[PDB]
Amino acid sequence: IEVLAVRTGPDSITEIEAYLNPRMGQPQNEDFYGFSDNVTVSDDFGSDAPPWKQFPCYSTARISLPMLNQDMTSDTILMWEAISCRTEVMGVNMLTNVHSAQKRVYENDREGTGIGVEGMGYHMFAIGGEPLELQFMVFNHRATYPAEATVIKNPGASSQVFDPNLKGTLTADGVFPVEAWGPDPFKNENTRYFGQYTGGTQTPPVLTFTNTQTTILLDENGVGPLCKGDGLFLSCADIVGFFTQHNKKMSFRGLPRYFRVTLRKRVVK
Amino acid sequence: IEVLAVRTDSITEIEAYLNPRMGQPQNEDFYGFSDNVTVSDDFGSDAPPWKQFPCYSTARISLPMLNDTILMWEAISCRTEVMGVNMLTNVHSAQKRVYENDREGTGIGVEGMGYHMFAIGGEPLELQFMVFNHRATYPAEATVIKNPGASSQVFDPNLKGTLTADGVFPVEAWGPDPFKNENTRYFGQYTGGTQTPPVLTFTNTQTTILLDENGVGPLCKGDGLFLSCADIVGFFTQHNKKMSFRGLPRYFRVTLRKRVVK
Amino acid sequence: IEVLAVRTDSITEIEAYLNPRMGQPQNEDFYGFSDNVTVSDDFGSDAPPWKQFPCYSTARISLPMLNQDMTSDTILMWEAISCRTEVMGVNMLTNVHSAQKRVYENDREGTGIGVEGMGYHMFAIGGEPLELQFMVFNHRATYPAEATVIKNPGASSQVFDPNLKGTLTADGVFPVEAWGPDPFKNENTRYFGQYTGGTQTPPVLTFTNTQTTILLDENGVGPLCKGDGLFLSCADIVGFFTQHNKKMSFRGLPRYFRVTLRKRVVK
Amino acid sequence: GIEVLAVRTDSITEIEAYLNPRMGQPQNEDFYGFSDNVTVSDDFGSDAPPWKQFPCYSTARISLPMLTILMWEAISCRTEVMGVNMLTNVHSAQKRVYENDREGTGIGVEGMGYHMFAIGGEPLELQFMVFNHRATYPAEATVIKNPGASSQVFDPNLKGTLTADGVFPVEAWGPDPFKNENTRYFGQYTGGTQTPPVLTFTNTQTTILLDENGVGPLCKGDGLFLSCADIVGFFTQHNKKMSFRGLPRYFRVTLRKRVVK
Amino acid sequence: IEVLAVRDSITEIEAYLNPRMGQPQNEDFYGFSDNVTVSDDFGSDAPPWKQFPCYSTARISLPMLNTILMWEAISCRTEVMGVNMLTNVHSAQKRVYENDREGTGIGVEGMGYHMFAIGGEPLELQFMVFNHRATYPAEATVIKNPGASSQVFDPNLKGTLTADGVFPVEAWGPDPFKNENTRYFGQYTGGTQTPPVLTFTNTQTTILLDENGVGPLCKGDGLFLSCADIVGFFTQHNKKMSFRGLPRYFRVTLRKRVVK
Ligand SMILES: CC(=O)N[C@H]1[C@@H](O[C@H]2[C@@H](O)[C@@H](CO)O[C@@H](O[C@H]3[C@@H](O)[C@@H](CO)O[C@H](O[C@@H]4[C@H](O)[C@@H](O)[C@H](O[C@H]5[C@H](O)[C@@H](O)[C@H](O)O[C@@H]5CO)O[C@@H]4CO)[C@@H]3O)[C@@H]2NC(C)=O)O[C@H](CO)[C@H](O)[C@@H]1O
Ligand SMILES: CC(=O)N[C@H]1[C@@H](O[C@H]2[C@@H](O)[C@@H](CO)O[C@@H](O[C@H]3[C@@H](O)[C@@H](CO)O[C@H](O[C@@H]4[C@H](O)[C@@H](O)[C@H](O[C@H]5[C@H](O)[C@@H](O)[C@H](O)O[C@@H]5CO)O[C@@H]4CO)[C@@H]3O)[C@@H]2NC(C)=O)O[C@H](CO)[C@H](O)[C@@H]1O
Ligand SMILES: CC(=O)N[C@H]1[C@@H](O[C@H]2[C@@H](O)[C@@H](CO)O[C@@H](O[C@H]3[C@@H](O)[C@@H](CO)O[C@H](O[C@@H]4[C@H](O)[C@@H](O)[C@H](O)O[C@@H]4CO)[C@@H]3O)[C@@H]2NC(C)=O)O[C@H](CO)[C@H](O)[C@@H]1O
Ligand SMILES: CC(=O)N[C@H]1[C@@H](O[C@H]2[C@@H](O)[C@@H](CO)O[C@@H](O[C@H]3[C@@H](O)[C@@H](CO)O[C@H](O[C@@H]4[C@H](O)[C@@H](O)[C@H](O)O[C@@H]4CO)[C@@H]3O)[C@@H]2NC(C)=O)O[C@H](CO)[C@H](O)[C@@H]1O
Ligand SMILES: CC(=O)N[C@H]1[C@@H](O[C@H]2[C@@H](O)[C@@H](CO)O[C@@H](O[C@H]3[C@@H](O)[C@@H](CO)O[C@H](O[C@@H]4[C@H](O)[C@@H](O)[C@H](O)O[C@@H]4CO)[C@@H]3O)[C@@H]2NC(C)=O)O[C@H](CO)[C@H](O)[C@@H]1O
Ligand SMILES: [Mg+2]
Ligand SMILES: [Mg+2]
Ligand SMILES: [Mg+2]
Ligand SMILES: [Mg+2]
Ligand SMILES: [Mg+2]
């Protein structure tokens, strides 16, 4: 793509808003939607087979954009260029719930609040003009992922660190495990991604929300993601931490993510 | 609303406080606290009693009356402060001791989750309904969506509300709607856990600008300014290990100017 | 006050210390500490003994003569334009040998645990006394006669009650846990505060002579020194000191102030 | 002592590279990315950390295109720790949160973070310094032998350059601030054994490598020198045995032609 | 010292200050304190020599000069060196799972105290102690029998950092009432199980100019460097704890300044 002039004026700019619900593992429209199933742990890397529902996967959607009024006789085409976004983790308010079926602070005394959601936070989003380009990488290569998940089967010892053969693209919602795929910094020339990990099992979650924050999506040449086939590609994972039951069974809890994206008309060859 | 020129008498300032609504009734000995928190055994039998959970504070401030083309009050800046941070230096009032097994040491003080948010707009705060457990039965006193469905545990575009009453919208069931609130600025921070150290700052030297990307502040519909907040500081722990929410009141100063509208 | 021109002899600087008022008597062996903290069984029978809780430090500093224009309708006031402030004695918290509960008390071993727990650090610079809001954790707390409080303040005193006001007019007698800065007043004071809670929380303190804070408001006007007085207030709870027998006391540190003032004309 | 003249303009090039971590366990075998299980000595006197139980620095020389002489001058970089996503695994053979109840997630990776990278026109210049000078390092490791009590703090004689991948122990060597005129280095250490790892990743961050005179690293022999270490924390087995876990690091470097004397 | 114009004219010095944590230099525990013992009351409190850290300090000789010229310190780089060593969790450390004799060592944990000073004369100190009844040993420079007011600020209790390795950190800090010709910077993070957090780079330069554009002016052609760098505690299997310290790098850039 040879990139040419920005279009300005009051037809040249549009705004889309979208949500991505989390895919922590439990099925939609059922009582544990937003949670994983209770996590089971292997005894050894050789006998490691995490059941479907017990691990989070990436959220993704393609957003169909408004009609561009293309010039019928020009040797150029217009594309939508994503220039800025707002993104917010929604439902942070729910984490003030320390009554719902939670292990108590003073369990020996059957007293105190629930311990609430605690432990690892993994928060990442991507805005691009094509699917997010992935690097496959796993803690344990010998892990057997379920039929329901999309992974590289028998990926070999090299998949525990960087191996340039082990590539993917985030093409489906809810089936790419977070623990087996990450953004590929050798690609994503037409996507912006942002991620933060805070680990632990008892770490306090820290989340902010405001409707006053905007992130510019322009690269060093002042070019934003260019939406190929007039699609905008949104991706995220938002693990807030763990929910712990009275019997000490632990599940992942996720929150949905809001996106507002401003796009403008860019001429290309 | 089509926005025209700033009218440059044309500047006013309001100060207001919102007291916390942590659950216990006002003018009684536990005002500013919740009642002691009980925990359900399972999501299917989860009915948090009234007084045991915090709700949002809200107030509408009446502004000087104004009025082809109307004048509206435009919120351009604010100061906000969590008041009474000084009270948290109290480690003597009926608190579990650091060395309970020795009947020695200070109180452990207030500890655990901090949830701090405020909003300033020209109409009520627009809410998104979302809950940890959709099967929670909220008490008659609370404003909620009843039988909200599994979908309410994440984002459901059907589950909307507005913050139209003080002390009855449960914090755990409602948050700001980023799909709306074009005429409101909101800010919030959550720090989780039950033994987390509270971190609070206060100064009369910080001003936040409320103008959007187009230089437009909140425009006060019907000459009303809408202030909203929740300020959970953490939990108070008794000797017998019963735990309650403690809240603090919030100060607002808002500066407004007259703006011409079509 | 109607504020006019700034003079550019025009500038002066004062330095001062405020020593902490943690509860134990001055120039006795526990100076800089509270007495060992006791805890009530219920809010109804809560009566914290004098010495076992910290109080605000305040001083009024006398400023140099202003050399007024005898015939002018206007007067000169000192305007505070900037400060440095530093908690002094941070060096002392490297002490883990002085009568402290040990890290491994079951083995009678390791360093002392040193000072840990809540940090409350606030300072105020103004041209009149700091204006305070009364607010308490428990309204039924009976404060001792030595302390300045609103008596029988009632339930509303657990949150914001616009009736419950005061001003910081004496050093070492206004309990930190009962009074805070009033954001509805203090037009002529700048205040700054940080609270970090807990009882095992590590103290975090920084010190440098390279930091200046500007005291000018949004109009370019600093605090104006009425009666040619500069008013300094602070509290610097560093955390708790824990004895081998697990008795716990507040430890405080003194605060340094440098304030740059200039001559302002007013009407 | 290189006389630097004018910037050229064909005159700009970009490289991308990965450095795999060197935490101790051998490449292309089941524990790649990890150390072996850490053993602890009883005293400084009898302290011999076995090969495979401690991390070493990663390093690589990138061959630039061949070029008053011209040199490649490194003006900017992006760097990223990759595979942060894998740390969401709490099922792979990990001690459980509630071991006494055989319940909960794995405890995951926790403890010390040590994150450092260097980009230079010559090998990174090193200062030898150790917690305990009486440590006997294994034959596979590159160390100063019998370094003396002075090697527990700064001793100006104890110098080195990072000239080999995977054999300079992190606990024995660090960047020399007395040298490295032709290298930019950055690091952070967060200690503890139960500390939560904190890691960020984005493709949107650029670091300018120009010094206070507007000069970037000048690539001697048309080579670019990349170095790092990325200890994320410890992996803890059910039997409480602990290993280092590391992650690979991404480098993008932008270079331009500089005229030199 | 009335200051005139800036002015061959620019020089740069580098130096290191080794830590003075308490154990003798050139011996096996160099960089550590001896194992810390704890008193039962403030009355009987007498910390033995080697069990507490002291400030490090050096005077650097500048090219001799000489309407007089003076060396003016305008900027610096400083760096805690040897941060790399803290990745050692094998050297005679209490283990994470001591009941199971398993896990890594717990490594260095607890209070960090990091301070440096750059000036044209010795750092000016305020004497302040946790416990005034502490009897410091003969080897240490203190104010003897300082009294109850020494627990807080007493304006009589002053000193200057004139010797390396004998001013106890816990007895002396920088005096904000003086030090007009010194820039100091410090941070304290307390606790005994706190994680150390240390950063290092060769890319960071700090400007030493005051509000008037004047850097430290080196009286007698001497540059004064001071520091303390307590990283945390080393814990043995038997749970004996010592301070561990790290050396500090200094780069200072100086220019000639005319004075009267
Ligand atoms: C992640 C995973 O799947 N972990 C499972 C695995 O644990 C083993 C691995 O972590 C490997 C990785 O190198 O380390 C073993 O630990 C060994 C290893 O560190 C070794 C040196 O490389 O030192 C110790 O072992 C000692 C000695 O070197 C061993 O040869 C020896 O082995 C003997 C066994 O004890 C006998 O039972 C066997 O009959 O004969 C051999 C001798 O040929 O034991 C020495 C003991 O000090 C480390 O222990 C890990 N092993 C263990 C036990 O943690 O496999 C284990 C089960 O073995 C679990 O499934 C674990 O989840
Ligand atoms: C801060 C302070 O001074 N607190 C002291 C106080 O604690 C009580 C308060 O914290 C109040 C604040 O609401 O809450 C009590 O706990 C109750 C309460 O939360 C209640 C619902 O509002 O739920 C439980 O109580 C159950 C039931 O609702 C009660 O009616 C009941 O009451 C019976 C008692 O069991 C009998 O002993 C009594 O003689 O008869 C009544 C029946 O009318 O108990 C039910 C639970 O078994 C909560 O417990 C606080 N109470 C306690 C015990 O913590 O007063 C206590 C001593 O009572 C301490 O001094 C405390 O420091
Ligand atoms: C939050 C809440 O209301 N929890 C109460 C509930 O707990 C159960 C739920 O958390 C569900 C969520 O899917 O999990 C049950 O745990 C199960 C599942 O994770 C299951 C796989 O889907 O794996 C385990 O069960 C297996 C097997 O699948 C079962 O058929 C068999 O009966 O037991 C097997 C034992 O491994 C796992 O236990 C939760 N059950 C328990 C128990 O925690 O209901 C319980 C009481 O039953 C409590 O009321 C919770 O508070
Ligand atoms: C890192 C290491 O290898 N540690 C092993 C070492 O421990 C000893 C060292 O840590 C030295 C460092 O100076 O201290 C020993 O502790 C002694 C000293 O601190 C001493 C004052 O210098 O005070 C104590 O001892 C007194 C007396 O002073 C001694 O002379 C007398 O013999 O014993 C007295 C008993 O109170 C203090 O204990 C460390 N010793 C011990 C023990 O921890 O050597 C030990 C073997 O002893 C272990 O192998 C450590 O891992
Ligand atoms: C730092 C140090 O050297 N501490 C040693 C010291 O401890 C005593 C000091 O902390 C003083 C400081 O004021 O307080 C003692 O505790 C007392 C006081 O808080 C007192 C009120 O002022 O209240 C308690 O005492 C009451 C009563 O007032 C006493 O007269 C009566 O005998 O006991 C009452 C309680 O039952 C409180 O205990 C500290 N005393 C003790 C004990 O901790 O001296 C002790 C030995 O006495 C140790 O050496 C400490 O390390
Ligand atoms: Mg590329
Ligand atoms: Mg909208
Ligand atoms: Mg006012
Ligand atoms: Mg050099
Ligand atoms: Mg002075």
Numbering used by the authors:
A (entry chain DDD): 22 to 290
B (entry chain EEE): 22 to 29, 32 to 90, 96 to 290
C (entry chain AAA): 22 to 29, 32 to 290
D (entry chain CCC): 21 to 29, 32 to 89, 97 to 290
E (entry chain BBB): 22 to 28, 32 to 90, 97 to 290
Sentences from the paper on this structure:
In this study, by means of glycan microarray screening, NMR, surface plasmon resonance (SPR), and cell binding assays, we show that FA, which is the predominant glycolipid in ovine erythrocytes, serves as a cellular attachment receptor for the VP1 of a polyomavirus originally identified in sheep. This designated sheep polyomavirus (ShPyV) is a member of a non-enveloped, double-stranded DNA virus family with icosahedral capsids, scaffolded by the major capsid protein VP1. We show that the Forssman antigen serves as a cellular attachment receptor for the major capsid protein VP1 of ShPyV. Thus, our studies present the first example of a polyomavirus VP1 protein interacting with a non-sialyl neutral glycan, complementing the principles of how polyomaviruses recognize their targets.
All five Forssman binding sites are identical and located between two neighboring VP1 monomers ([Fig fig4]). The intermolecular contacts show that the terminal trisaccharide of F_P_ contributes to binding, whereas the remaining βGal and Glc divert away from VP1 and do not interact with the protein surface. Additionally, the *N*-acetyl moiety of αGalNAc interacts with the Q266 and F66cw residues via hydrogen bonds ([Fig fig4]).
